[PDB]
């Protein structure tokens, strides 16, 4: 009675890979705009009263 124990398996099948990447949230949390100089400058323009 030749059972399955007589047979020898070969290379097991590679069913599925599994990588782990965080649900990155930075294209939604912040406002991005590429700068064309190594120094980036933001202008803050404000409206004041006679009391500043």
């Amino acid at each position: 009675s030749t059972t399955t124990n007589s047979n020898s398996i070969g290379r097991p099948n590679l069913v599925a890979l599994t990588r782990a990447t965080t649900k990155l949230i930075y294209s939604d949390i912040v406002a991005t705009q590429r700068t064309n100089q190594p120094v980036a400058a933001f202008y803050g323009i404000k409206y004041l009263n006679p009391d500043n």
């Binding site: 009675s1 030749t2 007589s6 047979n7 020898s8 070969g10």
Partner: peptide, 9 residues
């Protein structure tokens, strides 16, 4: 009388 085979790697 029985006959079989074996497969060894």
């Amino acid at each position: 009388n029985e006959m079989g085979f074996r497969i060894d790697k």
